[PDB]
Amino acid sequence: SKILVFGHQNPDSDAIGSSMAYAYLKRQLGVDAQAVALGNPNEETAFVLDYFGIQAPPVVKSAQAEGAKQVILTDHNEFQQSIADIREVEVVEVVDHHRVANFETANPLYMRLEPVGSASSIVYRLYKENGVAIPKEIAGVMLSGLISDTLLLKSPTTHASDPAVAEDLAKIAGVDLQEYGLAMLKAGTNLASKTAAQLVDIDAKTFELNGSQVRVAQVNTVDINEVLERQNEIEEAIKASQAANGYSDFVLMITDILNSNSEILALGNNTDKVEAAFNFTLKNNHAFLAGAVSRKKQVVPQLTESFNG
Amino acid sequence: SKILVFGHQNPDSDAIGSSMAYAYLKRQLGVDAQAVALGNPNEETAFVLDYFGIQAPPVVKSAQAEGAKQVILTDHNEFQQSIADIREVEVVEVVDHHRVANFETANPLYMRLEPVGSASSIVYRLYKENGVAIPKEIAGVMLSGLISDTLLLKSPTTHASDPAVAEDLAKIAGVDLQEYGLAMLKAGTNLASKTAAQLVDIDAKTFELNGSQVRVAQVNTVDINEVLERQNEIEEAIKASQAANGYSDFVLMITDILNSNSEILALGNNTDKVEAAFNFTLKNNHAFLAGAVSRKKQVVPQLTESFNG
Ligand SMILES: [Mg+2]
Ligand SMILES: [Mg+2]
Ligand SMILES: [Mn+2]
Ligand SMILES: [Mn+2]
Ligand SMILES: [Mn+2]
Ligand SMILES: [Mn+2]
């Protein structure tokens, strides 16, 4: 009866932070909940965990294997993004900031979705609404989740209310927003220590675009050209992944967080549709896409339009 | 920019109350929201609107027709229970206490689902959470929804937090909980004014139970015996429906909403799948199903299990 609280596959900072923050809150409310992760923390999240001196959630792969019948999803609701046997257990709660799709429950449940910058932002309000004090380290993982998802509040996903949230969490966490923000974001640009295969699967999701299974990965870097130093291995890793997972197209978003621009490297059957989604020309399989920092707002939408559905 | 707020087709008290109350709330929050209905009030709801003297929402049939592109749904989420052009508009918010299915959004949205007795109960908390004092008449329709969906807090669907809510909405609406409730519930048991075919179809559903097509209807009455005065005319309307709709089994629930029992009348090929389902014996085509007041929580399972899985 231990309720498992977890974010999406290829957990990012917001996924981990929101699940940890929410699990703690559930416990304060008398619920036997435990935060777990569907994968190992990425470099950005590792930085956060280390910073506030807390351990990463246990990594699990099957709810049933862990003997759990009830789960709480944070930072996602779509089944392909959840635990492998999500269809076999009961989803009792969901706290997320994404559109809803490929989600279904047999019974009523709790749901708190808000079209804001991060799932962590929502959990924060739940602490306030329940009158539960926020511990320093919990504030830290929540703040980190918000900072992560909004690129230190500079991303188009930043909601009007997020800055105030970010400000209060920073205070509770004992950090200077800009200083901590920049340090953490930079921690995610540690890509050299990763293999090409791992690099393209650090932060990636799949989208069904008018019948095409399109993989869209993102990475934060201090320089697009640095990431391209291994373009060959990366393209190779991309083609391999495409064959292994059934992807007709693979889009790699190389985001320069300093200059707020992203390089688009795409391979597959419909690279021409990619070129159409952004009106550019892929040379050696990539092109510059100025001002792009958000996958959900500045990439998927145009890819959706060009592929159509 | 004009958001319609509505409950589900064939609205009950909760559907009407929750949309009216919530729409009012959004307006106090600066959102140009308007409560609309997908049908006219039933005897129960007409009794409520009159008691607190307020007009029932205007019945509409299309969001596109009302000049609205955005909509807020209360007391439901499944598209088949919604507005005709639901897939054509944007769902900006959902307040409900049902399971989720046949629901999808292209973009992020606000969702507030809680596994409680009524949708009105959730709206109640939304008022307090937003610092908006609840208006007398509004408390009236909200209280009615809660009392209606939970049979004056007696149903298995009643949540631990529902009583206090019911209690507080009564105080605000200026009524005594126990009297207004009974008086309101009794007011809605008007069956003699409807034809047999109408009864067996005012609140029924269909369930595929291993190849069988079983109709399961529910009628609220203050006295089963009285409805049993029309047994014959009923079995006729039943046999008829089974002929026209292919139904292999028809189970009628004559729910006595004051004692919490439901006499089960069954005609069909598997009138044994039912007995073995409620461990009773159909003496005259019907048996006594004590404690039954909820179809899915007290009738579906056993049926679902007797027909085996
Ligand atoms: Mg992201
Ligand atoms: Mg009901
Ligand atoms: Mn995430
Ligand atoms: Mn997120
Ligand atoms: Mn309803
Ligand atoms: Mn309801």
CATH number, domain of B53, equals: 3.90.1640.10
Q: What are the two backbone dihedrals, phi and then psi, of residue B99, each rounded to the nearest 5 degrees?
A: -75, 165
Encoded amino acid at A52, one letter: F
- Closest in A97, A104, A110 to B108, CB measured: A97
Same domain, B136 and B259: no
Residue of B nearest to A112 (CA): B112
Element holding A294 (H helix, E strand): none
Give the separation between CA B36 and CA B23, rounded to whole angstroms: 9
Encoded amino acid at B203, one letter: D
Distances (CA, A) of A168 to A17, A53, A98, A247: 16, 20, 23, 42
B117 C-beta neighbours (distance < 10 Å), count? 30
Same domain, A206 and A298: yes
Which residues are bridge partners to A205 per DSSP? A216
Distances (CA, A) of A260 to A156, B100, B205: 11, 38, 54
Give the separation between CA B127 and CA B138, rounded to whole angstroms: 11
Number of domains in chain B: 2
Residue of A nearest to B125 (CA): A129
| Cβ contact B48:B77 at 8 Å | no
| Cβ contact B275:B268 at 8 Å | no
CA distance B96 to chain A (A): 9
Give the separation between CA A89 and CA B297, rounded to whole angstroms: 19
Give the separation between CA A147 and CA A178, rounded to whole angstroms: 10
Same domain, B37 and B139: yes
Same domain, B183 and B204: no
Give the separation between CA A236 and CA A234, rounded to whole angstroms: 5
Same domain, A45 and A61: yes
- Any idea what the Cα angle at residue B242 is, between residues B239 and B243, rounded to 5°? 90
- Any idea what the Cα angle at residue B3 is, between residues B2 and B4, rounded to 5°? 120
Which residues are bridge partners to A251 per DSSP? A216, A266
Domain that includes residue A25, residue range: 1-190
Same domain, A284 and A161: no
- CA A280, A283, A285, A291 dihedral sign is negative
Q: At what angle do helices B13-28 and B43-51 cross, to 10 degrees?
A: 40
For B:232-251, CB contacts with A below 8 A are none
Indicate the DSSP class of residue A11. -
Q: What spatial distance separates the first Cα and last Cα of chain A, rounded to whole Å?
A: 40
**A242 CA from centroid of ligand 1 (Å):** 21
| Reduced 3-state DSSP string for A22-60 | HHHHHHHCCCCEEECECCCCCHHHHHHHHHCCCCCCCEC
Give the separation between CA A7 and CA A278, rounded to whole angstroms: 30
| Cβ contact B153:B48 at 8 Å | no
Q: Which residues of B touch A108 (CB under 8 A)?
A: 97-99, 113-116
Over its C-alpha atoms, chain A yields an Rg (Å, rounded) of 19
Distances (CA, A) of B118 to A27, B60, B156, B157, B184: 25, 23, 12, 9, 16
The candidate with the shortest Cα–Cα distance to B74, out of B26, B134, B107, is: B26
Same domain, A211 and A174: no
- Closest in A97, A103, A129 to B100, CB measured: A103
Give the separation between CA B234 and CA B192, rounded to whole angstroms: 12
Same domain, B186 and B244: no
Encoded amino acid at A65, one letter: A
Residue B95 CA, chain-centre distance (Å), reads: 15
**Domain end residue (candidates: A146, A171, A190):** A190
Angstrom resolution of this structure: 2.2
**Domain end residue (candidates: B138, B170, B190):** B190
The candidate with the shortest Cα–Cα distance to A51, out of A174, A134, A220, is: A174
Token pair for A266? 């795409």
Q: Where residue B278 sits, what CATH number does that domain have?
A: 3.10.310.20
The candidate with the shortest Cα–Cα distance to A22, out of A119, A164, A97, is: A119
**A204 CA from centroid of ligand 3 (Å):** 10
A105 vs B103: CB contact, 8 Å cut-off? no
Give the separation between CA A88 and CA B91, rounded to whole angstroms: 28
The length of chain A, given as a count of residues = 309
β-pairing, B286-289 with B261-268? antiparallel
Q: What are the two backbone dihedrals, phi and then psi, of residue A178, each rounded to the nearest 5 degrees?
A: -55, -45
Contacts 24+ apart (CB under 8 A), B227-234: B227/B191, B227/B199, B227/B254, B228/B254, B228/B263, B228/B286, B230/B196, B231/B265, B231/B284, B231/B285, B231/B286, B233/B196, B234/B196, B234/B199, B234/B200, B234/B265
| Cβ contact B130:B26 at 8 Å | no
Q: Which residues of B touch A99 (CB under 8 A)?
A: 104-109
The candidate with the shortest Cα–Cα distance to B267, out of B244, B283, B278, B251, is: B251
Helix, strand, coil content of chain B in percent (nearest 5) = 40, 20, 40
Give the separation between CA A44 and CA A191, rounded to whole angstroms: 11
Give the separation between CA B131 and CA B281, rounded to whole angstroms: 54
Interface check A112 vs B, CB under 8 A: yes
Same domain, B179 and B200: no
**Domain end residue (candidates: B190, B209, B240):** B190
Indicate the DSSP class of residue B73. E
B159 known ligand binder: no
Burial classification of residue B266, based on how many CB atoms lie within 10 Å of its CB (0-12 exposed, 13-18 middle, 19 or more buried) = buried
Distances (CA, A) of B265 to B240, B255, B278: 15, 11, 12
- CA B228, B233, B234, B239 dihedral sign is positive
A230 C-beta neighbours (distance < 10 Å), count? 16
Q: What spatial distance separates the first Cα and last Cα of chain B, rounded to whole Å?
A: 48
Same domain, A6 and A93: yes
Indicate the DSSP class of residue B57. P
- Any idea what the Cα angle at residue A260 is, between residues A257 and A265, rounded to 5°? 85
User: Residues near B264 by Cβ (< 8 Å), separated by ≥ 6?
Assistant: B251, B252, B253, B254, B274, B278, B280, B282, B286, B287, B288, B289, B292, B299
Burial classification of residue B13, based on how many CB atoms lie within 10 Å of its CB (0-12 exposed, 13-18 middle, 19 or more buried) = buried
Residue of B nearest to A98 (CA): B108
Token pair for A280? 């550019």
User: Residues near A113 by Cβ (< 8 Å), separated by ≥ 6?
Assistant: A77, A94, A95, A96, A97, A98, A100, A122, B108, B109, B110, B111, B112
Give the separation between CA B23 and CA B31, rounded to whole angstroms: 9
**B75 CA from centroid of ligand 5 (Å):** 5
A108 vs B129: CB contact, 8 Å cut-off? no
Q: At what angle do helices B177-187 and B136-150 cross, to 10 degrees?
A: 70
Same domain, A170 and A48: yes
DSSP E strands, A126-176: none
Burial classification of residue B301, based on how many CB atoms lie within 10 Å of its CB (0-12 exposed, 13-18 middle, 19 or more buried) = exposed
Q: At what angle do helices B13-28 and B136-150 cross, to 10 degrees?
A: 150
Same domain, B87 and B213: no
